[PDB]
Design an enzyme around this catalytic site. Sequence first.
Site, short mmCIF file in Angstrom:
data_model
loop_
_atom_site.label_atom_id
_atom_site.label_comp_id
_atom_site.label_asym_id
_atom_site.label_seq_id
_atom_site.Cartn_x
_atom_site.Cartn_y
_atom_site.Cartn_z
N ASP A 298 40.90 26.51 43.53
CA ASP A 298 40.84 27.59 42.44
C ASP A 298 38.92 27.79 42.71
O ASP A 298 38.07 27.69 42.19
CB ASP A 298 40.87 26.63 41.06
CG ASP A 298 40.23 27.47 39.39
OD1 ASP A 298 40.23 29.14 40.31
OD2 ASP A 298 39.98 26.88 38.56
N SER B 244 35.70 46.58 41.15
CA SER B 244 36.49 47.60 42.12
C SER B 244 35.65 49.81 41.98
O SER B 244 35.62 49.53 40.69
CB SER B 244 38.39 47.67 41.41
OG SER B 244 38.75 48.43 42.49
#
Lengths: 329, 8
Positions: free
Chosen positions: A35, A198
């Site tokens: 994780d 992004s």
Amino acid sequence: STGSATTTPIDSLDDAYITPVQIGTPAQTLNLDFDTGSSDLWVFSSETTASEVXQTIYTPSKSTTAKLLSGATWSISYGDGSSSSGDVYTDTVSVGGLTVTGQAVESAKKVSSSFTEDSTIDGLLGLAFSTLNTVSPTQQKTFFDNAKASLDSPVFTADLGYHAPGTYNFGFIDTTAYTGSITYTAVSTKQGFWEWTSTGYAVGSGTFKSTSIDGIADTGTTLLYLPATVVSAYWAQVSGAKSSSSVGGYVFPCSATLPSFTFGVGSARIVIPGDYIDFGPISTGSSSCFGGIQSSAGIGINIFGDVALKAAFVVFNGATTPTLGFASK
Amino acid sequence: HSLFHXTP
């Protein structure tokens, strides 16, 4: 040194992936969920409340190298509200041939019901930054932090498969594992996550819209959660798609062919195939399917989860100034 | 088996 381990989807939907980890002396093998959204190494153990155990457990008393970490305790909760707590040992931990001595292994005294219900996950291995570790009074380093001194290079890569096994590698980059060149983007550690921005998105064969989407790379999250307007823009291209309250997300006819989704990485572009976004029918036999792209509005953060990451080769560069690298594969 | 959201 280096290490390489196979990671496998826990079910036919790629809900999560588990990677075998060796803990203790002689080794006890457990299937942990790697994780990158958390920084605790915790496992089911001989100390866990028995009615809460259904998993393979760690038995500290069977390990000659285990040592109790006196006075230390931990308590953690996750994005979906699930939680666990307990005490702490240090032990020897190995992943795919790479061995760390004195790794903090958090032993669960109690776990929430969703952990009990999922038989295939024996615990979690956290790979975010150590500032998120919940051990107190003194926080413990993650597996990656402990290994860095010994790694050929201070990196690990994720190569997750679509309905197929994949690989987690530590300390080297497998150039045969991707196509093209790797594009690196800066990471913010301010909140302790692999946080990045992004450069934009396109839907299907339409235009790329330049717009900053700050998000985190979370291998511990199944889906792709993006801002509502982005998500609306996607499902608008799917004629039978709609938002479903009863289900809590966008659904569509399982017969539809979904558009691809592209997200930007600097000047590069990563394309998620339409099929990856078809997450699965809402129930077996159903004519409706759940979408793999959902709104991040009620979460508070955009999350690049497995749907997104399994479409790429991902490089977690843990140098003093860390970066994220993406390649097409 | 659920959908997973690994910590706030």
